[PDB]
């Protein structure tokens, strides 16, 4: 889409092995690659590669960032974990995998991640320290519109 982050979000590679042999290698001299050869792939191409085959072209193993490891890691103390370190595009992404793969539980978890995050993120409304570094890009911009709102507001409040 026309937000840079939308073409940028599919710039992430996901573990995927193909269910078929694929002559005309997309990458160098296969020319085919044998079925079930593991490869990290951009979501923009991969997203449909499941939708067409009724068995799909691609198997799509679970991503490294959605591991039980991380999924409960966030469940422990959401504020402390660094989202910038993980992707950094996550809410801009996890939304895409939860659409494409259509999961139901991790959602109810993830939403809460952003919730707690925002509970804190509002607390910076007042005029960082270590925190400002570790935010996701959308988590970084929410800060912009939110903060700058105040940043104008107080400047109005006095002269």
């Amino acid at each position: 889409y026309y937000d840079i982050d939308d073409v940028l979000a599919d710039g992430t590679e996901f573990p995927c092995k193909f269910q078929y042999d694929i002559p005309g290698l997309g990458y160098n001299p296969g020319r085919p690659i044998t079925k079930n050869t593991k490869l990290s792939l951009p979501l923009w191409l991969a997203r449909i590669l499941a939708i067409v085959g009724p068995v799909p072209f691609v198997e799509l193993l679970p991503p490294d960032m959605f591991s039980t490891k991380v999924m409960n890691a966030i469940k422990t103390d959401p504020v402390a974990l660094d989202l910038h370190s993980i992707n950094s595009h996550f809410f801009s992404l996890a939304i895409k995998w939860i659409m494409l793969f259509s999961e139901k539980e991790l959602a109810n978890v993830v939403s809460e991640l952003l919730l707690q995050r925002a509970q804190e993120l509002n607390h910076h409304a007042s005029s960082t320290s270590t925190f400002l570094l570790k935010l996701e890009e959308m988590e970084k911009e929410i800060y912009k519109k939110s903060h700058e709102s105040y940043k104008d507001t107080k400047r109005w409040m006095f002269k």
Binding site: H124, A125, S126, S127, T128, S129, M157, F158, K159
Partner: protein, 602 residues
């Protein structure tokens, strides 16, 4: 204490009532910081003297007996601010600074003891974090009476009242609350007032949000209170408890670090990048003192920015930024120059050694003769990490860890396997070699090599090596000689640089903030073809110095020399604040080391 409670009301008044037109600055500051979890407030004593003189007159009198009271109210203030009731809320810290009036350290005796003293000095070494009590409670060893002590500041042994006796109480360690304490060892400023003697160090102590606020070895200002405690007649050890501490300009820096942001910087730093003269105007920042020597003058800049440092897996990592040689005849200005260079660095250590001033040039681990157990004592190179390396007398450097310089410059590290400790500790420090060459101009008609100790390899270890040759030549002098008498009185050249400040030139305390600024953004990099150009340039540098060596001349060149010139590219580029580097961009870095190639040809 209800007198103190009236004082409590007095400060609650002080906060709720006070106004700068119209917001109540401290009041805003509170709800601001409670979400920071700062739990502390910095109050101008002038808004205080402006609010009520009385409370200060008694505050300035025995502040020790009041400062906690001052807090007991503002910690209550948060109660009437943070939340509404009808948790747990930590007892506040307070940090007060004021313009005040500066006092020199050598004159501090008796008198002002147990009062406020603003003063600067400089910290030498940081003590390790030492945690101290905040709340503690105790059951009796005998009657099992449950005591609760709030330990407050600012010794005091545990109270014995419910055999029962003499004092049957041991801490409930499980339920207790705590705080850190720093124990600053800090030293008077280098300039005043040594008279003839040695600089004193007077010990002070941080706590809570004051801790780790100040780097070892940086210029700082502490206010605090002059006081004493026994610490094995009556002969008690002098010290100062700390409130509040403020960095001398900035110093901020640490860690990661600071801007913050004051937007005009980005623009003003970008306009610098849009100034074609900026590289060269940096060159004109470096020596208001030194007129001329523009070559090495361009050479200093590129170091400070930091060069390419790229970590590519596996653990292989190449250094930045590099090394430089000021070796040349006395009259080079290179010590005067270096005494510019270190003052330029945000963080660095000036070493004329041997090692400076008393420093083992490398950290020398030395046993605490009390309670045994070797501990690393720190080192000039160690403390200067991520900062400039200053060296004079490099003819004379310690030979054993001369090699630790032969190493730390390159591998960005020093390995100490000595005694117990095996830790390989970081010196990313970038060296500038200022030593005086053997016999001055006499190594010029000789083999210019082996000039440095007994091996030529040190040169390879260094990068930008520069031989400064001043013949007594006409008119290049008469203009700098003209420059001289202006420089001295009345600073007729130091006024002439202030209209270049308005016209062009940088302020250079700025230059700190510039180089601090663009060293924290990610490392710049060249496009491929300037590199291949380094390949056809150097294939002829190396070709040239085998052909130059057709005379069987001993020497000088390595493959770390080409790479050395590489790092100069990302240096001069990091000036630009550009992720890339242009062909010619790199090219004047080439012409910049090209004089050193003729240093090989001479």
């Amino acid at each position: 204490d209800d007198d103190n409670t009236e004082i409590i009301k007095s400060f609650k008044n002080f906060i709720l009532e006070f106004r700068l037109d119209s917001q109540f600055i401290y009041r805003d500051q509170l709800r601001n910081n409670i979400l920071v979890k700062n739990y502390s407030l910095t109050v101008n004593m002038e808004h205080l003297i402006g609010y009520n003189e009385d409370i200060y007159k008694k505050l300035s009198d025995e502040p020790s007996d009041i400062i906690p009271l001052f807090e007991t109210a503002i910690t209550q203030v948060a109660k009437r601010i943070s939340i509404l009731s009808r948790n747990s809320l930590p007892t506040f810290q307070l940090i007060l600074n004021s313009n005040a009036n500066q006092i020199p350290l050598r004159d501090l005796d008796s008198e002002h003891v147990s009062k406020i003293v603003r003063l600067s000095g400089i910290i030498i070494s940081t003590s390790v974090l030492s945690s101290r009590a905040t709340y503690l409670s105790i059951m009796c060893r005998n009657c099992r009476h449950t005591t609760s002590i709030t330990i407050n500041n600012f010794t005091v042994s545990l109270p014995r009242s419910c055999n029962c006796g003499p004092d049957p109480y041991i801490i409930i360690h499980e339920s207790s609350k705590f705080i850190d304490q720093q124990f600053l060892k800090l030293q008077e400023i280098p300039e005043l007032v040594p008279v003839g003697e040695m600089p004193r160090n007077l010990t002070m102590t941080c706590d809570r949000y004051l801790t780790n606020k100040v780097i070892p070895g940086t210029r700082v200002t502490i206010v605090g209170i002059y006081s004493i405690y026994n610490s094995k007649v009556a002969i008690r050890t002098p010290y100062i408890k700390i409130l509040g501490i403020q960095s001398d300009v900035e110093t901020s820096s640490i860690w990661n670090s600071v801007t913050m942001f004051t937007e005009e910087e980005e623009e003003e730093f970008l306009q610098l990048s849009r100034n074609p003269k900026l590289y060269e105007i940096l060159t004109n920042s470096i020596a208001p003192s030194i007129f001329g020597n523009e070559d090495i003058k361009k050479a200093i800049v590129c170091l400070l920015m930091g060069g390419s440092k790229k970590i590519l897996p596996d653990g292989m990592r190449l250094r930045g930024d590099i090394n430089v040689l000021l070796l040349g005849d006395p009259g080079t200005a290179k010590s005067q120059l270096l005494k510019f260079v270190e003052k330029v660095s945000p963080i660095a250590v000036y070493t004329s050694g041997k090692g400076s001033s008393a420093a083992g040039l490398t950290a020398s681990v030395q046993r605490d003769p009390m309670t045994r157990e070797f501990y690393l004592e720190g080192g000039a190179m160690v403390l200067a990490d991520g900062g400039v390396v200053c060296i004079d007398e490099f003819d004379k450097m310690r030979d054993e860890d001369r090699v630790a310089i032969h190493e730390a410059m390159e591998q960005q590290t020093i390995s100490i396997a000595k005694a117990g400790i095996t830790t390989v500790l970081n010196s990313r420090t970038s060296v500038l070699a200022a030593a005086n060459p053997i016999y001055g101009r006499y190594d010029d008609l000789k083999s210019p090599g082996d000039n440095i100790d007994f091996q030529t390899t040190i040169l390879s270890r260094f990068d930008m090596i520069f031989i400064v040759k001043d013949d007594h030549n006409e008119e290049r002098d008469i203009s700098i000689a003209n420059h001289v008498i202006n420089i001295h009185t009345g600073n007729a050249n130091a006024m002439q640089n202030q209209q270049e400040e308005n016209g062009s030139e940088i302020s250079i305390e700025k230059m700190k903030r510039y180089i601090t600024y663009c060293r924290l953004k990610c490392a710049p990099r060249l496009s491929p073809q300037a590199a291949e150009k380094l390949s056809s340039n150097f294939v002829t540098i190396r070709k040239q110095l085998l052909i130059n060596e057709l005379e069987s001349t001993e020497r000088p060149i390595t493959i770390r020399q080409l790479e050395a010139i590489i790092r100069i590219t990302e240096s001069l580029a990091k000036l630009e604040l550009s992720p890339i580097a242009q062909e010619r961009h790199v090219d004047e870095a080439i012409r910049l080391f090209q004089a050193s190639t003729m240093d090989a040809a001479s």
